[PDB]
């Protein structure tokens, strides 16, 4: 369980594709680009680390 | 020819009007009911702990579709803590005919800032003209704190962009929020946010409630009462300084209520969480009157303007750190229209 704020809300789509590729569920409030990501905790870090290579987001623990 | 009376049924007990002193003040002894009782198609979003959907006083105004529980992902089925029902009654007693929609983001354990934002956005997209958030968090503005605030600010921007008013309780810590920020690096959210109207609580005497948070963010005040004017120092509770609330009818109310023969469905209470919805209720009244007179919707700024100019200027002359622009009075609001 962590939280993400995209720099740009248009990148919601690229967020939901990285999340599915790491079997983590990302619940995004589209209009503000703020998401709650839940899944298994080993994989939250690689999800954060490959989401970080394409889109800009800040993460909360 | 009949004396005016509260919209609440009060179980027919005429003595309960004493505890509705705040409502009589707001509505000019309920004269506003014949000036503007509110429109059923003006909707106030209740971001709170759910709602007692079949409360005798609230069921006529409850959104027929009920509302969403974000904690369990189910439609709202009731109100476990009673908090949202108390908040709902304050909207209702001022504007008995506006629609109230519960967005349940709180229960016993508390709530998540995330669900408040989601409810804000949904409430906007669902055609609500007013949002009331009678809860908040004290957030440290470290790295993750600033991100939460940044997120929260976008939600507020979204409501403002769509001309939706958002009213929030200022909080009950009896602290100066500006001093809290410089000393503790904390902020009270969402009340501190731009485009969120932060509301404090005054007493029957119009003195600020001792618990009411103060600061430059305070915009308005409303009568939320307290246990006593000086209870904090002398231990004495003056029950006439408290305010009546609608309380879940199937829930036991307090020993103080029982001793005063307040039947279930009502409870004596206090707080900024009870002040904010009085202003939200007043806003819904202004929107209802304005739409009735022009068949156009007013801007958020227009309603805010009416609230601001009709407020009673208390304390230092002008917008001060204790009362903001001052105490909101619904009948004055309508009178200036």
PDB file of C-alpha atoms in Angstrom, chain A residues 1 3 5-9 27-29 31-36 58-61, chain B residues 112-115 117-118 121 125 143-145 147-148 150-152 154-156 158:
ATOM      1  CA  UNK A   1       0.000   0.000   0.000  1.00  0.00           C
ATOM      2  CA  UNK A   3       0.340   6.479  -3.070  1.00  0.00           C
ATOM      3  CA  UNK A   5       0.936  11.719  -7.684  1.00  0.00           C
ATOM      4  CA  UNK A   6       1.615  12.034 -11.436  1.00  0.00           C
ATOM      5  CA  UNK A   7       3.166  15.237 -12.693  1.00  0.00           C
ATOM      6  CA  UNK A   8       0.714  14.998 -15.553  1.00  0.00           C
ATOM      7  CA  UNK A   9      -2.707  13.477 -15.374  1.00  0.00           C
ATOM      8  CA  UNK A  27      -6.573   3.034  -8.180  1.00  0.00           C
ATOM      9  CA  UNK A  28      -6.337   6.412  -9.834  1.00  0.00           C
ATOM     10  CA  UNK A  29      -8.376   9.536  -9.314  1.00  0.00           C
ATOM     11  CA  UNK A  31      -8.793  14.313 -12.686  1.00  0.00           C
ATOM     12  CA  UNK A  32      -6.026  14.915 -10.171  1.00  0.00           C
ATOM     13  CA  UNK A  33      -3.654  12.114 -11.198  1.00  0.00           C
ATOM     14  CA  UNK A  34      -3.395  10.664  -7.717  1.00  0.00           C
ATOM     15  CA  UNK A  35      -3.351   6.936  -7.197  1.00  0.00           C
ATOM     16  CA  UNK A  36      -3.371   4.348  -4.469  1.00  0.00           C
ATOM     17  CA  UNK A  58       6.165  11.372  -6.582  1.00  0.00           C
ATOM     18  CA  UNK A  59       5.513   8.456  -4.205  1.00  0.00           C
ATOM     19  CA  UNK A  60       4.193   8.299  -0.646  1.00  0.00           C
ATOM     20  CA  UNK A  61       4.836   5.563   1.913  1.00  0.00           C
TER      21      UNK A  61
ATOM     22  CA  UNK B 112      -7.978   8.426   4.501  1.00  0.00           C
ATOM     23  CA  UNK B 113      -7.196  11.749   2.865  1.00  0.00           C
ATOM     24  CA  UNK B 114      -7.237   9.856  -0.427  1.00  0.00           C
ATOM     25  CA  UNK B 115     -10.898   8.936  -0.111  1.00  0.00           C
ATOM     26  CA  UNK B 117     -10.199  13.678  -2.535  1.00  0.00           C
ATOM     27  CA  UNK B 118     -11.952  10.940  -4.488  1.00  0.00           C
ATOM     28  CA  UNK B 121     -14.026  14.788  -7.349  1.00  0.00           C
ATOM     29  CA  UNK B 125     -18.857  15.219 -11.400  1.00  0.00           C
ATOM     30  CA  UNK B 143       8.394  15.513   1.556  1.00  0.00           C
ATOM     31  CA  UNK B 144       5.404  13.162   1.566  1.00  0.00           C
ATOM     32  CA  UNK B 145       3.339  15.793   3.373  1.00  0.00           C
ATOM     33  CA  UNK B 147       2.828  15.751  -2.011  1.00  0.00           C
ATOM     34  CA  UNK B 148      -0.394  14.985  -0.130  1.00  0.00           C
ATOM     35  CA  UNK B 150      -0.302  19.105  -3.635  1.00  0.00           C
ATOM     36  CA  UNK B 151      -2.764  16.345  -4.462  1.00  0.00           C
ATOM     37  CA  UNK B 152      -5.335  17.778  -2.145  1.00  0.00           C
ATOM     38  CA  UNK B 154      -5.702  19.723  -7.164  1.00  0.00           C
ATOM     39  CA  UNK B 155      -8.981  18.353  -5.859  1.00  0.00           C
ATOM     40  CA  UNK B 156      -9.828  21.793  -4.524  1.00  0.00           C
ATOM     41  CA  UNK B 158     -11.160  20.927  -9.633  1.00  0.00           C
TER      42      UNK B 158
END
